[PDB]
């Protein structure tokens, strides 16, 4: 409407500023950058020279000039153009920004591969549209293969930058209800697994070759969770976190290149922190997030105790102390808290390593719910 309906940009800026203040965003620029991918994709999808990238309304993002707009948003503009093979346009952007186009292409590599790799990954569908998506991905990738741009250094760039591609692939998950639609990619779990498999053929072994990668992926996921103040994208980022943690647990008994203890401790403490800062239990999405966190904690504890027989004595006390208050919430979470505690202390007396750990533990509250747990504690 700003482009053609004649809406005055100052009134639109006023309304958008008021709305962004309502949602809790510090500045309008962040609020409009949160939806920049969708806006640019739907702008380019309008097959008209009137709606090209130059005519895109940049005044609604509080950008004075085109140059500053590019300075701030080329990271998201370049991948959208490159997937359409508009290399003349990315050359023009580089010339305007007085930066080399090779540097911009290298710096936007993972967001480029997000639109390329999953279409290689999954095949055999009868959907024609996905077939032309695969064809476009293949042609764009082989254009990138040419020596004129990126040369033959694509292999070194890919091998030396894997965690960024991994996190960018993860951040496109969308399982489908009433949840809002995320950014355009919208890649389900199975296609992401296929992408990981395809990268492996050309995944966790390569990451284990540099054991510090898992820290980077977890840090990025937690950072994007923390910057979010909403609940819908918070639950989404929790879904990505659960997916990545599950995949990482599936690669146990390999040692993760000696990184198993650190990632185990980090995941346990992150889940404990998420559980501790629960706002309330009156919103459905909050309950879903709480259940997901409890399930992830139960799964990781079970995997660690089964396939390590150790590395849980240093975290048993904090886990138990965090889980104890959760029983007085409601039956839905009480059942899972109780059965997790029962797995940890009741049916675990056969292990001598954690015998001492259970012995040196705080007594359970003297209520009926903890009767079996209290009896086992007293006996042990």
């Amino acid at each position: 409407s700003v482009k053609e309906n004649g809406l005055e940009p100052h009134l639109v800026k006023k309304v958008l500023e008021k709305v962004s203040e309502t949602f809790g965003y510090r500045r309008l620029e962040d609020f409009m950058a949160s939806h920049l991918d969708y806006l640019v994709l739907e702008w380019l999808n309008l097959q008209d020279t009137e709606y090209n990238l130059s005519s895109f309304p940049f005044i609604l993002l509080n950008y004075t000039n085109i140059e500053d707009f590019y300075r701030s948003c080329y990271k998201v503009l370049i991948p959208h153009l490159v997937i359409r093979s508009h290399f003349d346009e990315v050359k023009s952007i580089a010339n305007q920004i007085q930066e080399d186009w090779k540097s911009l292409l290298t710096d936007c590599f993972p967001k480029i591969l997000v639109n390329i790799l999953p279409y290689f990954a999954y095949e055999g569908t009868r959907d024609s549209g996905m077939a032309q998506q695969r064809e476009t991905a293949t042609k764009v990738y082989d254009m990138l293969k040419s020596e004129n741009l990126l040369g033959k250094q694509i292999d070194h760039l890919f091998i030396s930058n894997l965690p960024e591609i991994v996190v960018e692939l993860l951040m496109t998950l969308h399982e489908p209800d009433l949840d809002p639609a995320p950014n355009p990619p919208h890649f389900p779990s199975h296609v992401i697994k296929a992408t990981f498999a395809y990268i492996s053929n050309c995944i966790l072994e390569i990451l284990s070759k540099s054991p510090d990668s898992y820290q980077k992926i977890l840090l990025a996921i937690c950072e994007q969770a923390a910057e979010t103040n909403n609940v819908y994208k918070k639950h989404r980022i929790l879904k990505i976190y659960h997916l990545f943690v599950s995949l990482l647990l599936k690669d146990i008994k390999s040692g993760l290149g000696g990184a198993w203890a650190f990632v185990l401790r980090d995941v346990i403490y992150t889940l404990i922190h998420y559980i501790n800062q629960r706002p309330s239990c009156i919103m459905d999405v909050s309950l879903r997030s709480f259940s997901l966190c409890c399930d992830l904690l139960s799964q990781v504890c079970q995997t660690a105790v089964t396939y390590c027989k150790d590395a849980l004595e240093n975290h048993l006390h904090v886990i138990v102390g965090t889980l104890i208050p959760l029983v007085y919430e409601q039956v839905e979470v009480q059942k899972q808290v109780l059965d997790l505690l029962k797995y940890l202390v009741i049916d675990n007396k056969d292990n001598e390593n954690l015998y001492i750990t259970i012995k040196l533990l705080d007594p359970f509250p003297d209520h009926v719910v903890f009767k079996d747990l209290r009896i086992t504690q007293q006996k042990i």
Partner: protein, 134 residues
């Protein structure tokens, strides 16, 4: 030990600084001089810090840049005396000024700048070591 302890804090801004400090420290002369003498013991920090250490041909060197005129960033009376309130920025600025090319021949120092920037208790802990080394 302090960085390993702070690796499990709820905030996400000191964890990145902590892992950066581990990566920088454990790749120098003193990092290996420490690992060799400390690997003979039993401690969970050995297993926790395994990913962050790497075997490289050349160990990391800290740039010992020499200021044209030292003693100028620490001669200010306002720097050395805070106000009635606002102790955090006072200690942070004092620690940062102490890390601005003034002495500090030790290589593990000059690598704790991000941790000092993001945390105050770390500044309070590290200030005596900076003064002693200078």
């Amino acid at each position: 030990t302090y960085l390993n302890n702070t690796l499990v804090e709820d905030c996400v801004k000191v964890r990145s600084a902590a892992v950066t400090c581990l990566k920088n420290i454990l790749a120098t002369k003193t990092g290996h001089s420490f690992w060799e003498i400390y690997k003979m013991t039993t401690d969970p920090m050995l297993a926790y810090l395994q990913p962050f250490r790497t075997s490289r041909k050349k160990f990391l060197e800290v740039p010992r840049f020499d200021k044209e005129n030292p003693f100028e960033g620490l001669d200010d009376i306002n720097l050395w005396i805070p106000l009635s309130e606002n102790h955090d920025i006072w200690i942070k600025t004092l620690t940062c000024a102490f890390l601005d090319s003034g002495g500090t021949k030790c290589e593990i120092l000059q690598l704790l700048k991000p941790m000092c920037e993001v945390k105050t208790d770390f500044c309070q802990t590290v200030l005596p070591y900076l003064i002693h080394d200078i």
